[PDB]
Amino acid sequence: NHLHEIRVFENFDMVSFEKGHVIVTTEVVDKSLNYYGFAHGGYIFTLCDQISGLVSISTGFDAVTLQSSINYLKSGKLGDTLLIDGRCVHDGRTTKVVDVTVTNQLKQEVAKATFTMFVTGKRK
Amino acid sequence: NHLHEIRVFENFDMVSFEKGHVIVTTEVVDKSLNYYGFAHGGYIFTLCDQISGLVSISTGFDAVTLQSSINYLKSGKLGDTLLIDGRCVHDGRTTKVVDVTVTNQLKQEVAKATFTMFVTGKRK
Ligand SMILES: [Cl-]
């Protein structure tokens, strides 16, 4: 109803984990959805966000996210396989910037986000 | 381990619901958390996003978010009571803009987000 539980990553498949580049798919399920029956904005954002943290790990660093921005282009629907592709855009000393695109099986872009992260330090 | 389920709104309390202004609280629990034991940035954003949709309902409309921006200021921690306050800063015929702030019980800001919405229709 007006407030309800939402879940993210009840399922996933990690397709490729590469330097500054991470691809993961997932399928939209009942608890992915908002009250109008479409994939929830928060759900979509969290897909992007997790992938961006993995991009960040893939360049060697701990880095925390200071700000993000997302555009919602098309609806996610129940049963869609969504492809989440994170790419490092700036791999810096002090900051990182990661772009993420969400895509459906037609390869239409569902959402695009950018995450601006502060480099705390190396990963070991 | 690296990809994992997250849940949002496993508990909540609807504090107030007024024209252009909605307050909800929630308590940070185990499935709110990221690998480091703090509230996940996607869980945080999803709290803001749902509240902004209620703000849009509160001004009498269905709306869909085109774009959001969020700034993370302070970590949420396990057990925290978070207060999510959404306010309509633009209540337009064709667009709505909603600011949401998340604070802890000290009134320290945990995050602030802004949501840019397209009006799809009048409620009922
Ligand atoms: Cl529920």
Cα–Cα distance for residue pair A21/B97, rounded to 1 Å: 33
Handedness of CA B121, B63, A108, A28 (dihedral sign): negative
Contact between A43 and B46 (Cβ < 8 Å): yes
> What is d(CA A2, CA B15) in angstroms, rounded to the nearest whole number?
13
A101 touches A45 (CB < 8 A): no
Distance of CA B106 to the CA centre of its chain: 18
Q: Is residue A43 exposed (0-12), middle (13-18) or buried (19+ Cβ within 10 Å)?
A: buried
Tokens found for residue B30:
């185990």
- On whether A103 is known to bind a ligand per the annotation, the reply is no
* Beta carbons of B8 and B43 less than 8 angstroms apart: yes
**What is the C-alpha separation between A41 and A77, in angstroms, rounded?**
12
Closest-CA residue to B52 (of B99, B102, B105, B89): B99
- What is the C-alpha separation between A54 and B58, in angstroms, rounded? 37
CA dihedral B8, B6, B44, B85 (to 10 degrees): 0
Residue whose tokens read 């978070």: B82
How far is the centre of ligand 1, averaged over its atoms, from the C-alpha of B23 (Å)?
18
Residue A37 φ/ψ region, left for φ over 0, alpha for ψ in the -120 to 50 degree band, beta for the rest: left
Count, in order, helices (H) and strands (E) of chain A. Answer: 1, 7
Q: Pick from B70, B68, B40: which is nearest to A41 by CA?
A: B68
Resolution (A): 2.1
Measured CA to CA in angstroms, residue B73 lies from A37, B55, B101 at distances of: 32, 23, 11
User: A19 in the Ramachandran plot: left (φ > 0), alpha (ψ -120 to 50) or beta?
Assistant: beta
Is residue B25 part of an annotated ligand binding site? no
As a residue count, chain A comes to 124
CA distance, residue A49 to nearest chain B CA (Å): 6
In chain B, beta strands by DSSP E: 6-8, 13-18, 21-27, 61-72, 81-91, 95-103, 109-122
Q: Which chain B residues have a beta carbon less than 8 Å from that of A5?
A: 7-10
Q: Take residue A56 and report the two structure tokens written for it.
A: 């960040």
Technique that determined the structure: X-ray
Q: Which domains does chain A have, with CATH numbers?
A: 1-124 (3.10.129.10)
CA B37 to chain centre: 20
